[PDB]
Design a protein around this ligand. Structure first.
Ligand SMILES: Nc1nc2c(ncn2[C@@H]2O[C@H](COP(=O)(O)OP(=O)(O)OP(=O)(O)O)[C@@H](O)[C@H]2O)c(=O)[nH]1
Ligand SMILES: Nc1nc2c(ncn2[C@@H]2O[C@H](COP(=O)(O)OP(=O)(O)OP(=O)(O)O)[C@@H](O)[C@H]2O)c(=O)[nH]1
Ligand SMILES: [Mg+2]
Ligand SMILES: [Mg+2]
Length: 320
């Protein structure tokens, strides 16, 4: 079922910031809009505008991006580093700046725990907001907390977005890397279809993903098993679930822990409730049964037909 996974990949992959003129524009369209919006806010105050360094983030930066489904949204992720001290301003306050700036932008802007989200026709931009490392003691620090949140969970947390993008790019090379990237995209479309924060699956793959190839010693021509590579990876993930008592709920929930391989090394999955976590393992187990099925049991049509319960109506199914 490889040539089907390769077709699937071609259908779902979305060109990274570097190879995607039209995504740089919708990113630029929002940065240009911030600076302009920052004049309309930091003039009222009496003080001068804060200046920021933007940079690319997330899957569009790491070449692991997929095209949204219909009635889904492109997820454009930029960081912005403002020249301020982390020990002077308040994380949400600083995010408040960004929202009001983009108020008159698109369908408006919401403050999230780890970014300001802003909306538009058929996409959104998440803007992670950092304190200057120079004014802040040498550590890059992301603004954590929502308008509705306490002060315990108002933080300036040590971050390494470029470090993380780096681990993903560095994991393997050539066609072993290319297999790794195809498998992240497959599971993202699965996420998009049947909901496992894409970072979650990306961190998971960094740790657990193993290449599935057969190398012809005589012909020195290698052949990739994308199907088997996913079954092995998904099994490893399921395997790594541990039953986890919730005393509030007086019930056990299964739970997968995946530490970021860069600072702060948090469990990326830590903000999924034990409820969220069990229906994540339910779907993962459903996905894995389909992947086993496709290796032989069923013939190409019913094989592919199974996968499409998991991967969606863009998974190619041959007619029977
Ligand atoms: N430190 C930290 N950074 C995170 C976390 N979640 C997301 N990020 C960062 O924010 C970026 C965008 O997150 P997402 O949009 O959820 O994921 P993605 O890797 O871009 O993949 P998609 O699912 O295709 O959007 C990630 O690539 C990270 O750099 C987290 O839990 N901790
Ligand atoms: N740079 C960075 N981006 C993050 C991080 N966590 C999440 N994101 C981004 O923020 C987007 C929205 O996710 P969250 O910030 O977790 O959203 P939320 O609903 O406020 O979070 P909860 O309060 O946990 O429900 C994701 O799509 C990511 O792109 C993080 O630690 N670092
Ligand atoms: Mg993203
Ligand atoms: Mg996002």
């Amino acid at each position: 079922v490889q040539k089907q996974f390769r077709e699937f990949h071609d259908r779902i992959k979305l060109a990274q910031y570097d190879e995607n003129q039209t995504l740089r524009d919708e990113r630029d369209a929002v940065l240009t809009a911030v600076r302009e919006g920052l004049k309309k806010v930091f003039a009222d105050r009496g003080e001068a505008a804060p200046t920021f360094t933007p940079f690319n983030q997330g899957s569009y930066a790491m070449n692991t991006g997929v095209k949204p489904l219909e009635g889904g949204e492109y997820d454009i992720d930029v960081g912005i580093i403002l020249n301020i001290a982390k020990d002077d301003h308040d994380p949400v306050e600083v995010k408040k700046w960004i929202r009001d700036a983009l108020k008159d932008y698109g369908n408006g802007a919401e403050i999230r725990r780890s970014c300001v989200t802003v909306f538009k026709p058929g996409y959104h931009v998440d803007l992670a907001v950092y304190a200057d490392p120079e004014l802040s003691g040498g550590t890059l620090c992301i603004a954590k907390g929502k308008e509705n949140s306490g002060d315990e969970h108002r933080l300036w947390q040590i971050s390494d977005p470029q470090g993380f993008q780096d681990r993903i790019a560095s994991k393997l090379s050539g066609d072993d890397a290319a297999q790794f990237r195809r498998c992240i995209r497959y599971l993202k479309r699965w996420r998009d279809f049947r909901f496992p924060l894409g970072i979650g699956l990306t961190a998971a793959a960094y740790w657990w993903f193993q290449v599935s190839k057969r190398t012809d010693p005589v012909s020195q021509n290698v052949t990739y098993d994308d199907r088997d590579a996913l079954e092995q990876f998904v099994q490893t993930m399921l395997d790594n679930f541990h039953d986890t008592w919730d005393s509030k709920d007086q019930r056990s929930y299964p739970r997968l822990t995946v530490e970021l391989p860069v600072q702060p090394y948090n469990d990326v999955f830590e903000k999924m409730t034990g409820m969220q976590m069990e229906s994540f393992k339910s779907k993962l187990q459903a996905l894995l049964n389909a992947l086993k099925t496709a290796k032989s049991r069923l013939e190409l049509h019913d094989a592919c037909k199974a996968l499409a319960d998991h991967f969606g109506s863009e998974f190619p199914v041959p007619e029977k």
